[PDB]
Amino acid sequence: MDVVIASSGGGWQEAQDKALWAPAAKALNITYTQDTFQNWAEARAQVESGSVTWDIIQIGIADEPQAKAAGVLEKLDPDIVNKADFPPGSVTDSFVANSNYSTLIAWNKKTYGDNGPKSMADFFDVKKFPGKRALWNQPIGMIEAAALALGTPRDKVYEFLSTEEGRKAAIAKLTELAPSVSVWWESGAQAAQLIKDGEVDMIITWGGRVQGAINDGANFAYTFNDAQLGTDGYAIVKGAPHRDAAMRFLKEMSKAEYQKDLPNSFATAPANMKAYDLAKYTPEKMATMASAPENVAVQYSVDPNFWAKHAKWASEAYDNVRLSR
Numbered sequence: 001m002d003v004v005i006a007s008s009g010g011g012w013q014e015a016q017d018k019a020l021w022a023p024a025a026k027a028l029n030i031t032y033t034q035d036t037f038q039n040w041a042e043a044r045a046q047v048e049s050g051s052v053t054w055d056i057i058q059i060g061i062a063d064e065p066q067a068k069a070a071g072v073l074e075k076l077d078p079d080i081v082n083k084a085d086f087p088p089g090s091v092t093d094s095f096v097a098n099s100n101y102s103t104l105i106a107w108n109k110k111t112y113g114d115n116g117p118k119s120m121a122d123f124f125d126v127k128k129f130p131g132k133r134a135l136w137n138q139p140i141g142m143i144e145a146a147a148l149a150l151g152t153p154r155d156k157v158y159e160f161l162s163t164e165e166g167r168k169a170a171i172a173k174l175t176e177l178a179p180s181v182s183v184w185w186e187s188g189a190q191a192a193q194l195i196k197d198g199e200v201d202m203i204i205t206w207g208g209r210v211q212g213a214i215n216d217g218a219n220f221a222y223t224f225n226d227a228q229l230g231t232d233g234y235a236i237v238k239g240a241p242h243r244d245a246a247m248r249f250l251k252e253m254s255k256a257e258y259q260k261d262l263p264n265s266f267a268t269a270p271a272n273m274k275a276y277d278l279a280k281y282t283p284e285k286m287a288t289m290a291s292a293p294e295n296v297a298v299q300y301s302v303d304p305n306f307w308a309k310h311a312k313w314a315s316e317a318y319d320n321v322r323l324s325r
């Protein structure tokens with residue numbers, strides 16, 4: 001009888017549960033069960049099997065087009081949110097944004113001190129910065145990182161990846177780096193643990209996971225330079241067993257009154273513009289936020305239109321880079 005909600009575990013899932021799920025479910029007087037997953041294809045497997053157990057799934061904005069095309073997502077009720085309260089394009093007919101985050105470069109201060117990599121060109125430069133690299137085992141942010149390393153200006157990432165030539169060169173760049181990649185991390189918590197144990201010299205991972213590891217004593221530093229500004233959000237699984245209750249739950253948790261608490265401990269940025277007026281975050285708090293003006297200036301936004309067209313190519317080609325060893 002519980003609504004089943006799933007995200008990717010660790011500090012991020014804990015932040016959503018504390019700020020959004022527990023207070024929203026209390027207000028609606030409903031019960032819910034949590035689950036965890038890393039790949040949107042796991043939601044597809046539930047749909048393909050004919051046994052859907054998940055109701056709400058937290059996915060990345062760039063997985064939304066391929067999930068919707070594969071018939072994995074329920075169409076949401078018309079006025080689930082007022083689109084004017086959220087960033088443009090962050091709310092689709094099948095997805096409601098809950099946050100902005102960054103896929104960024106972090107480095108081990110024991111290895112490099114303050115003179116760590118401060119750009120993707122630096123991250124890919126094994127001669128100037130020798131050491132163990134860690135990259136995600138999924139391609140969003142990883143293909144673009146290679147395009148940036150090749151010298152592509154931040155505002156031209158997706159123009160470069162719009163051609164076959166550019167897409168192949170980006171994979172060739174990742175192939176070149178692959179022998180220096182000690183671990184292809186799978187979850188944010190695993191990435192945070194690699195950082196806390198100093199098991200890697202540099203890593204491309206999510207800002208909240210990095211800041212959480214540093215708060216826990218990791219001797220790492222990071223930059224927003226060349227980071228990808230992402231958007232996470234919620235969708236309802238096609239054939240969700242508690243579809244109607246899940247719709248009410250998603251509408252409630254998207255409210256400004258809950259969104260304001262999302263970054264209380266975890267370094268994330270709420271997507272609901274009204275949450276900023278309620279919480280009145282200090283400039284120190286804003287500095288860790290992916291969407292703060294000073295951080296946006298050195299980032300580029302993920303392009304869901306690119307991922308709508310090339311996700312299948314990207315998944316297979318990147319699988320081969322990591323399988324090359």
Ligand SMILES: NC(=O)CC[C@H](NC[C@@H](O)[C@@H](O)[C@H](O)[C@H](O)CO)C(=O)O
Pocket residue numbers: 008012038039040058059060061063099100101138188206208209231232267268269
């Ligand atoms: N929004 C945030 O502050 C969290 C950022 C980050 N979330 C990564 C997600 O895009 C990712 O796990 C996707 O949900 C997943 O691949 C399926 O779409 C994290 O798990 O630390």
Ligand SMILES: [Ca+2]
Pocket residue numbers: 059060061062063140230
């Ligand atoms: Ca994502």
Ligand SMILES: [Ca+2]
Pocket residue numbers: 009010011012188189192209212
């Ligand atoms: Ca974590």
